[PDB]
């Protein structure tokens, strides 16, 4: 027979279940619909559905009333929308989490084995006719081809939104504390337990590595003055694992917390900035609390950074990305009246989606210099050579690149992209269209609709044969972008629900933890309530260069 | 100086914090009070406080209107009270959790290191004058003395509430899936990760031990027919760790999931009952879903047992214990409208409190026989000798013993009790009185008040010197009981908030997970919605003996 769940009969998040030898059932519990496949709207849902404006429209309101917005901004209406934006967006991520690479059903194991990345949608049944279930060709497009043909960059297409490189890295740095696929266990597993913003890419992802990094005195972290400025410590004091190439394992071979952070000045840069911050947070605290030991000073300053990060990521990172006129705001109390689980579990689909490699430019301008990938990659003096102030000022000036539209992934890194498309298949993520539904959107009816153009469109059809067959990672990049937007519709509609669920689902954001004593003192609490990119930098330097998630001018 | 937090200046859950060299501050955020020590009621709190009846009174209403109750029982008023009972009780356990044996403050570590048991109240500062902080003698009563003098049983005082042994064990069995203090790491740490009702005392507490126990076919568990009846499998097929004494490690040396369950027929008994159930749940499922593999059949049946257990524990276990006329009810939906975190972390204070060793009788009647501890303990044929039906019928007939009042802990096990009092000190739990406050009660003003009598009372004063010095585990047993109640006031007022927070905080109880598809089919869902002690037994036997948490007649 043909495993009925292969057609994806259940709609609106209904659970498909095999019953007997060839039949199935949809569990439409709390889906808002009743019916064999959850297709009959309840009295209200019907109301909801008929009165709900398109995401297309909403994204239009948020990006146009440059007046209605300055006003809505200066009032509570701002908080109302924030509290709205949040709740609604987050209400889409099943929490407690649901499935993993091993189970396409709820299990105690899935719940408790932190190692497993979690999936929003189950996987395409190993017995389904086509690779994607029902429609498509017996073979998905050779990802080697698919890549170079549509994702390989020809002419560097800069991000119309002004995004710069200073953002490009922070983005990379920041995302590598929860995305850490285990080579050993393979796709669908993560070393980054804690699944969130625990800065385990600073303090490391294990007590030992932390200890090996911890200078167990004043709660601070180790480090070394090179040129007079503070930098991370080398393995020769911070005896901990890394990935620096076999060459000078002693000097300029720094320990950070995120094993791979030596392979690019940008990563080590920020890494330095944060460490420089932590110890800075310790200096303040210690003054406020002399009767405090090392353990406290450490943990508390950590929280002050888990805070600061969650604030900058929201009021500055997501802001820039959003392009909204609405001025996002981070105030955990906005949900104290909602039903909101304070727990997160990174998702494989949220992982793929975050592969914004096309951000990375052609070369790397640094004042008059202009390092190439060979020069840049694995370099190890650039950072201490140029100094933080300077290097920051350099990224904050060179633009990043459009992430959507297609064809804008530098060739050097284009390999990554091909592997993502290969893993996605290993994982068996359902069709791009199937994810559109799940994330409150309409399934595309044609490639011509997917893509703004006609070329890539026809050609893709030729390959996938049927729009529904189309894949997750590819569609997400081959999709037409909102005019001037850094990326298309599906990226935000799918990204935000994962992002905000993650940002606010953080324990520190809960009523329980959100007090001034959790940051010991009022001082701690304010450092979180007022963090800035500009402050994370200029408060840990000698001079204040230029820094922002967008190019000046 | 004297560490100010040693006086416990902060009231109503206010957080004490050292500021400078000798001063402190109370963080009264959301405590309902403002003021240097959180002593000034907010407009509402004041309302709340003035209009709130005593726990003494409430426990009186719940245990008296044998008419007003039969009525309130047959109506929604029942659900209202349940939903009330729950929420309110659970609102007392800080979740996300707060501190552990290592930190008397919020920390990312405390949050994430599952190993650590969690504490409700911080610990008595290592620098405080007295052992308990401010009041008392330079030395706590020699726990060896304290025990034998007030906890050592003289004449067996049976539980007025009718509780029997069939309950005594289920209680023990059930509580050992979350209470598993690590000899290695020591007091304040637990092997039982998952901190809850995950039946990791059946399927074991690690994937391997599970696998070693799993018969990887039909999702069932291994086992062996002895006499014709099904029993657990020996290490010779279920190659897994245990603690059976060095003697006959081959035959009648059974593997269960809970390492220690061989050391008492009662434990192995239930262990058998549940296993016998699981495989039973598999037989049903498999019929409903032939197209199902082993992994599914396993996980799903597991959930059906995590369910069943949470139902019997609530509508029958807590019921009997409660003595309420209100008929408790397990229906997860009752909280779907409340703000309730679906996560739990066992607490050291909840651990101590659960040391109901005085339950265990003098000997063990089994029809005409009458095994002693020597005979009973570590026996290994009694179970297969007598057969489940019979042994169940035997415990369900012999009474248990009052848990409170003092002096009712058999001598054989009295050692346990002395260690509990020793560990409590290792842990540094604050004074019994300090916990009364924290759990919505008034601090005792004298031993004469604590205890109903005058003797133990005076004598104890002589020892502790000041009521406030009194300890946690001791007060909890030396406290006078509610007339006819199995134990005093402080046990329920402190136990329920830990219990219900734990029972409903279970992932399966959440909206997300509480669907019929999580138990695959409607059949699964009903097995959970209708479990009984009587069914957990008589549905896994040849004949239906007598079974209940109370003696017949
Ligand atoms: C999260 O989840 C992942 C898995 O998704 C966990 O990692 C995996 O863990 C398993 C077990 O720990 C591991 O197992 C693999 O399977 C091999 C097969 O084993 C054989 O077949 C059965 C299995 O039980 C046995 O009957 C066999 O007989 C043995 O019995 C004797 C008993 O003493 C053995 O001593 C003797 O060897 C005999 O053969 C036999 O065991 C297994 O042999 C091998 O270990 C292999 O690794 C997976 O490989 C793990 N890796 C992954 C990523 O899949 C992970 O632990 C979970 N996370 C946490 C912390 O809970
Ligand atoms: C939950 O939390 C518990 C702890 O509360 C965790 O278990 C404990 O884990 C720690 C570390 O893993 C372990 O450490 C103990 O401390 C000894 C002291 O170590 C020395 O002093 C410092 C410490 O970092 C170092 O500077 C010293 O120098 C070393 O540096 C070299 C670097 O390569 C070393 O190779 C070399 O040996 C050198 O001496 C030195 O390390 C430590 O030596 C020893 O391991 C000791 O065990 C605790 O003992 C653990 N046990 C407990 C229960 O306390 C647990 O892991 C957490 N749970 C999880 C899973 O997160
Ligand atoms: C938006 C974030 C971001 C950026 C800017 C970025 C920038 C760069 C970059 C530019 C200097 C280079 C040379 C690389 C190179 C790599 N990246 Co990324 N990566 C990023 C997010 C990721 C993620 C996410 C993964 C997958 C593994 C994981 O962390 O789970 C990744 C994986 C890789 C891999 C391993 C193979 C694979 O999974 O395909 C290589 C090699 N990379 N990356
Ligand atoms: C209400 C539950 C219950 C019962 C009926 C029970 C019945 C019995 C019993 C009767 C046949 C005997 C001989 C024992 C014997 C022991 N019990 Co318990 N125990 C119980 C709950 C506990 C807990 C809880 C612990 C502490 C360790 C842990 O599991 O974390 C414990 C610990 C012990 C220890 C280890 C030392 C210590 O911590 O003091 C011994 C020995 N015992 N127990
Ligand atoms: C690593 O980076 C350094 C600079 O940080 C590179 O050295 C510079 O190279 C350019 C030309 O490539 C010279 O004009 C500069 O004067 C150099 N700066 C100094 C003073 O060192 C170096 O080539 C890079 N190494 C690698 C890995 O390619
Ligand atoms: C283990 O339990 C068995 C019974 O299950 C004990 O054997 C019984 O002992 C009594 C007297 O103590 C006899 O009258 C019964 O006839 C015995 N039952 C049978 C048929 O074995 C045995 O003594 C116990 N062993 C230990 C550890 O003491
Ligand atoms: C529910 O979903 C199934 C799956 O696609 C629908 O399909 C079945 O019935 C169709 C309408 O008659 C046929 O075209 C299909 O052959 C048949 N396939 C399967 C999987 O059974 C079914 O109609 C849907 N029901 C509703 C109410 O729309
Ligand atoms: C707040 O708590 C402290 C701690 O007990 C109270 O005690 C201080 O002031 C008392 C009243 O004058 C004195 O008896 C104590 O010597 C002094 N001790 C400490 C720890 O400072 C304080 O009065 C309380 N304040 C209120 C408003 O009740
Ligand atoms: C789980 C830890 C935090 C992960 C998320 C942090 C950054 C994610 C990056 C982008 C977010 C998703 C889409 C980008 C544009 C802004 C999203 C829309 C905002 C909204 O409307 O709510
Ligand atoms: C965390 C896993 C579950 C732990 C709890 C299960 C059983 C606990 C035992 C006793 C509960 C506490 C007091 C006993 C009497 C009943 C409590 C009062 C009930 C109420 O009023 O809500
Ligand atoms: C127009 C914005 C009004 C305030 C925010 C409303 C919620 C915005 O958030 C999101 O908007 C999307 C549309 O792009 C919807 O598809 C999502 O379901 C919704 O969560
Ligand atoms: C309030 C609901 C009105 C009807 C639904 C929205 C009307 C169409 O909305 C349109 O959607 C387009 C798609 O991106 C945008 O480009 C347009 O700016 C917007 O006006
Ligand atoms: C009309 C909806 C409320 C907000 C409107 C914001 C945009 C109004 O459009 C206005 O057009 C004018 C003509 O060139 C310019 O002078 C203004 O700068 C521009 O904001
Ligand atoms: C009289 C019972 C009315 C319905 C249940 C109300 C909440 C009962 O529950 C508990 O009662 C205790 C009193 O013993 C209080 O101290 C606790 O704070 C409360 O949670
Ligand atoms: C509605 C509030 C009325 C005033 C507070 C309760 C009145 C006293 O309540 C009493 O408490 C005693 C203590 O256990 C019980 O023994 C009595 O049965 C009860 O009547
Ligand atoms: C009065 C509060 C409402 C419920 C009252 C339940 C208890 C009433 O007391 C009644 O006393 C009678 C005299 O012997 C007996 O016949 C009844 O069985 C007994 O329930």
Tab-separated table of N, CA, C and O in Angstrom, chain B residues 311-375:
chain	number	residue	atom	x	y	z
B	311	UNK	N	-2.410	9.535	37.030
B	311	UNK	CA	-3.820	9.540	37.357
B	311	UNK	C	-4.075	8.823	38.653
B	311	UNK	O	-4.796	9.329	39.503
B	312	UNK	N	-3.498	7.643	38.815
B	312	UNK	CA	-3.706	6.911	40.052
B	312	UNK	C	-3.065	7.650	41.218
B	312	UNK	O	-3.638	7.738	42.297
B	313	UNK	N	-1.883	8.197	41.011
B	313	UNK	CA	-1.253	8.917	42.093
B	313	UNK	C	-2.165	10.035	42.587
B	313	UNK	O	-2.285	10.243	43.782
B	314	UNK	N	-2.829	10.740	41.679
B	314	UNK	CA	-3.708	11.835	42.085
B	314	UNK	C	-5.103	11.444	42.580
B	314	UNK	O	-5.456	11.740	43.711
B	315	UNK	N	-5.905	10.783	41.757
B	315	UNK	CA	-7.248	10.427	42.197
B	315	UNK	C	-7.368	9.308	43.230
B	315	UNK	O	-8.469	9.030	43.705
B	316	UNK	N	-6.255	8.663	43.582
B	316	UNK	CA	-6.271	7.574	44.569
B	316	UNK	C	-5.175	7.676	45.628
B	316	UNK	O	-5.424	7.478	46.818
B	317	UNK	N	-3.964	7.995	45.205
B	317	UNK	CA	-2.872	8.107	46.147
B	317	UNK	C	-3.081	9.342	47.022
B	317	UNK	O	-3.345	9.223	48.219
B	318	UNK	N	-2.991	10.525	46.424
B	318	UNK	CA	-3.159	11.760	47.180
B	318	UNK	C	-4.504	11.827	47.874
B	318	UNK	O	-4.618	12.374	48.967
B	319	UNK	N	-5.521	11.272	47.229
B	319	UNK	CA	-6.869	11.251	47.779
B	319	UNK	C	-6.823	10.638	49.179
B	319	UNK	O	-7.090	11.313	50.174
B	320	UNK	N	-6.476	9.356	49.245
B	320	UNK	CA	-6.385	8.628	50.508
B	320	UNK	C	-5.598	9.405	51.547
B	320	UNK	O	-5.999	9.548	52.693
B	321	UNK	N	-4.461	9.908	51.124
B	321	UNK	CA	-3.606	10.659	52.004
B	321	UNK	C	-4.312	11.917	52.501
B	321	UNK	O	-4.298	12.225	53.696
B	322	UNK	N	-4.926	12.640	51.569
B	322	UNK	CA	-5.613	13.893	51.878
B	322	UNK	C	-6.672	13.775	52.962
B	322	UNK	O	-6.674	14.551	53.919
B	323	UNK	N	-7.568	12.801	52.806
B	323	UNK	CA	-8.643	12.618	53.763
B	323	UNK	C	-9.779	13.569	53.421
B	323	UNK	O	-10.761	13.692	54.153
B	324	UNK	N	-9.642	14.243	52.285
B	324	UNK	CA	-10.641	15.195	51.839
B	324	UNK	C	-11.955	14.544	51.444
B	324	UNK	O	-12.010	13.355	51.131
B	325	UNK	N	-13.019	15.340	51.494
B	325	UNK	CA	-14.351	14.905	51.102
B	325	UNK	C	-14.437	15.317	49.644
B	325	UNK	O	-15.186	14.738	48.856
B	326	UNK	N	-13.663	16.347	49.308
B	326	UNK	CA	-13.587	16.820	47.944
B	326	UNK	C	-12.953	15.645	47.237
B	326	UNK	O	-12.020	15.029	47.734
B	327	UNK	N	-13.470	15.331	46.074
B	327	UNK	CA	-12.980	14.211	45.311
B	327	UNK	C	-11.988	14.718	44.277
B	327	UNK	O	-12.381	15.196	43.225
B	328	UNK	N	-10.703	14.629	44.587
B	328	UNK	CA	-9.663	15.083	43.669
B	328	UNK	C	-9.894	14.571	42.254
B	328	UNK	O	-10.558	13.556	42.057
B	329	UNK	N	-9.352	15.278	41.268
B	329	UNK	CA	-9.512	14.873	39.876
B	329	UNK	C	-8.342	15.251	38.983
B	329	UNK	O	-7.814	16.363	39.055
B	330	UNK	N	-7.946	14.305	38.138
B	330	UNK	CA	-6.853	14.529	37.212
B	330	UNK	C	-7.362	14.800	35.797
B	330	UNK	O	-7.795	13.895	35.082
B	331	UNK	N	-7.318	16.065	35.411
B	331	UNK	CA	-7.749	16.491	34.097
B	331	UNK	C	-6.906	17.693	33.715
B	331	UNK	O	-7.282	18.833	33.965
B	332	UNK	N	-5.754	17.442	33.079
B	332	UNK	CA	-4.787	18.446	32.631
B	332	UNK	C	-5.393	19.702	32.040
B	332	UNK	O	-4.812	20.774	32.171
B	333	UNK	N	-6.547	19.575	31.390
B	333	UNK	CA	-7.200	20.727	30.772
B	333	UNK	C	-7.584	21.812	31.779
B	333	UNK	O	-7.753	22.971	31.410
B	334	UNK	N	-7.715	21.437	33.050
B	334	UNK	CA	-8.081	22.386	34.099
B	334	UNK	C	-7.135	23.560	34.204
B	334	UNK	O	-7.482	24.569	34.795
B	335	UNK	N	-5.942	23.432	33.641
B	335	UNK	CA	-4.956	24.498	33.712
B	335	UNK	C	-4.699	25.136	32.357
B	335	UNK	O	-3.932	26.077	32.252
B	336	UNK	N	-5.339	24.635	31.313
B	336	UNK	CA	-5.108	25.191	29.987
B	336	UNK	C	-5.368	26.681	29.904
B	336	UNK	O	-5.034	27.313	28.902
B	337	UNK	N	-5.979	27.238	30.944
B	337	UNK	CA	-6.274	28.660	30.946
B	337	UNK	C	-5.427	29.437	31.934
B	337	UNK	O	-5.560	30.656	32.057
B	338	UNK	N	-4.544	28.732	32.633
B	338	UNK	CA	-3.679	29.344	33.629
B	338	UNK	C	-2.271	29.524	33.105
B	338	UNK	O	-1.914	29.011	32.050
B	339	UNK	N	-1.479	30.284	33.847
B	339	UNK	CA	-0.094	30.482	33.489
B	339	UNK	C	0.616	29.414	34.295
B	339	UNK	O	0.778	29.553	35.512
B	340	UNK	N	1.039	28.350	33.624
B	340	UNK	CA	1.675	27.258	34.329
B	340	UNK	C	2.827	26.623	33.577
B	340	UNK	O	2.630	26.025	32.527
B	341	UNK	N	4.034	26.738	34.123
B	341	UNK	CA	5.211	26.156	33.492
B	341	UNK	C	5.172	24.637	33.553
B	341	UNK	O	4.945	24.065	34.617
B	342	UNK	N	5.384	23.980	32.418
B	342	UNK	CA	5.373	22.522	32.390
B	342	UNK	C	6.800	21.962	32.552
B	342	UNK	O	7.354	21.324	31.656
B	343	UNK	N	7.388	22.219	33.716
B	343	UNK	CA	8.739	21.774	34.017
B	343	UNK	C	8.878	21.626	35.515
B	343	UNK	O	8.304	22.405	36.260
B	344	UNK	N	9.640	20.632	35.950
B	344	UNK	CA	9.852	20.416	37.373
B	344	UNK	C	11.305	20.065	37.671
B	344	UNK	O	12.045	19.598	36.808
B	345	UNK	N	11.698	20.305	38.914
B	345	UNK	CA	13.043	20.045	39.378
B	345	UNK	C	12.903	19.637	40.829
B	345	UNK	O	12.607	20.485	41.672
B	346	UNK	N	13.100	18.355	41.124
B	346	UNK	CA	12.981	17.870	42.494
B	346	UNK	C	13.815	18.685	43.472
B	346	UNK	O	14.938	19.087	43.173
B	347	UNK	N	13.243	18.917	44.646
B	347	UNK	CA	13.875	19.718	45.677
B	347	UNK	C	14.335	18.910	46.872
B	347	UNK	O	13.638	18.004	47.315
B	348	UNK	N	15.504	19.254	47.403
B	348	UNK	CA	16.054	18.564	48.560
B	348	UNK	C	15.088	18.623	49.713
B	348	UNK	O	14.972	17.665	50.463
B	349	UNK	N	14.396	19.746	49.862
B	349	UNK	CA	13.428	19.863	50.945
B	349	UNK	C	12.236	18.962	50.692
B	349	UNK	O	11.619	18.476	51.638
B	350	UNK	N	11.899	18.747	49.421
B	350	UNK	CA	10.774	17.877	49.085
B	350	UNK	C	11.224	16.448	49.297
B	350	UNK	O	10.419	15.567	49.567
B	351	UNK	N	12.527	16.232	49.188
B	351	UNK	CA	13.107	14.918	49.392
B	351	UNK	C	13.017	14.558	50.873
B	351	UNK	O	12.364	13.589	51.233
B	352	UNK	N	13.650	15.345	51.732
B	352	UNK	CA	13.606	15.069	53.160
B	352	UNK	C	12.187	14.760	53.576
B	352	UNK	O	11.899	13.695	54.097
B	353	UNK	N	11.305	15.720	53.335
B	353	UNK	CA	9.885	15.627	53.664
B	353	UNK	C	9.226	14.299	53.315
B	353	UNK	O	8.306	13.852	54.003
B	354	UNK	N	9.686	13.678	52.236
B	354	UNK	CA	9.108	12.419	51.783
B	354	UNK	C	9.638	11.186	52.493
B	354	UNK	O	9.339	10.064	52.101
B	355	UNK	N	10.423	11.389	53.541
B	355	UNK	CA	10.943	10.263	54.285
B	355	UNK	C	9.887	9.765	55.243
B	355	UNK	O	9.934	10.035	56.440
B	356	UNK	N	8.930	9.028	54.691
B	356	UNK	CA	7.828	8.471	55.454
B	356	UNK	C	8.124	7.058	55.951
B	356	UNK	O	7.232	6.199	55.975
B	357	UNK	N	9.367	6.824	56.364
B	357	UNK	CA	9.776	5.508	56.838
B	357	UNK	C	8.891	4.927	57.945
B	357	UNK	O	8.702	3.696	58.018
B	358	UNK	N	8.352	5.791	58.836
B	358	UNK	CA	7.483	5.280	59.902
B	358	UNK	C	6.270	4.508	59.362
B	358	UNK	O	5.522	3.897	60.126
B	359	UNK	N	6.079	4.537	58.044
B	359	UNK	CA	4.985	3.792	57.411
B	359	UNK	C	5.203	2.291	57.638
B	359	UNK	O	4.288	1.561	58.015
B	360	UNK	N	6.434	1.849	57.399
B	360	UNK	CA	6.813	0.453	57.552
B	360	UNK	C	6.514	-0.054	58.948
B	360	UNK	O	6.968	0.518	59.939
B	361	UNK	N	5.765	-1.161	59.036
B	361	UNK	CA	5.313	-1.857	60.240
B	361	UNK	C	6.380	-2.550	61.086
B	361	UNK	O	7.570	-2.229	61.016
B	362	UNK	N	5.922	-3.493	61.911
B	362	UNK	CA	6.805	-4.276	62.779
B	362	UNK	C	7.306	-5.527	62.035
B	362	UNK	O	8.513	-5.759	61.927
B	363	UNK	N	6.378	-6.325	61.524
B	363	UNK	CA	6.741	-7.507	60.767
B	363	UNK	C	5.971	-7.401	59.461
B	363	UNK	O	5.583	-6.306	59.073
B	364	UNK	N	5.751	-8.519	58.778
B	364	UNK	CA	5.023	-8.501	57.515
B	364	UNK	C	4.145	-9.735	57.403
B	364	UNK	O	4.597	-10.819	57.029
B	365	UNK	N	2.878	-9.561	57.752
B	365	UNK	CA	1.919	-10.649	57.695
B	365	UNK	C	1.627	-10.989	56.232
B	365	UNK	O	1.502	-10.096	55.384
B	366	UNK	N	1.541	-12.283	55.938
B	366	UNK	CA	1.254	-12.736	54.584
B	366	UNK	C	0.368	-13.973	54.690
B	366	UNK	O	0.792	-15.095	54.409
B	367	UNK	N	-0.880	-13.744	55.091
B	367	UNK	CA	-1.829	-14.832	55.269
B	367	UNK	C	-1.489	-15.397	56.631
B	367	UNK	O	-1.482	-14.655	57.623
B	368	UNK	N	-1.211	-16.702	56.729
B	368	UNK	CA	-0.871	-17.204	58.066
B	368	UNK	C	0.602	-16.904	58.443
B	368	UNK	O	0.912	-16.708	59.625
B	369	UNK	N	1.493	-16.842	57.448
B	369	UNK	CA	2.913	-16.546	57.697
B	369	UNK	C	3.047	-15.193	58.412
B	369	UNK	O	2.038	-14.555	58.722
B	370	UNK	N	4.275	-14.758	58.685
B	370	UNK	CA	4.486	-13.463	59.332
B	370	UNK	C	5.949	-13.025	59.321
B	370	UNK	O	6.515	-12.681	60.363
B	371	UNK	N	6.551	-13.013	58.137
B	371	UNK	CA	7.959	-12.649	57.967
B	371	UNK	C	8.459	-11.428	58.732
B	371	UNK	O	7.752	-10.436	58.868
B	372	UNK	N	9.684	-11.518	59.240
B	372	UNK	CA	10.295	-10.419	59.975
B	372	UNK	C	11.148	-9.670	58.976
B	372	UNK	O	11.145	-9.988	57.797
B	373	UNK	N	11.890	-8.680	59.444
B	373	UNK	CA	12.736	-7.918	58.542
B	373	UNK	C	13.835	-8.778	57.927
B	373	UNK	O	14.117	-8.685	56.726
B	374	UNK	N	14.450	-9.616	58.757
B	374	UNK	CA	15.520	-10.496	58.317
B	374	UNK	C	14.980	-11.324	57.168
B	374	UNK	O	15.568	-11.367	56.084
B	375	UNK	N	13.847	-11.970	57.416
B	375	UNK	CA	13.187	-12.804	56.420
B	375	UNK	C	12.775	-11.998	55.184
B	375	UNK	O	13.047	-12.373	54.039
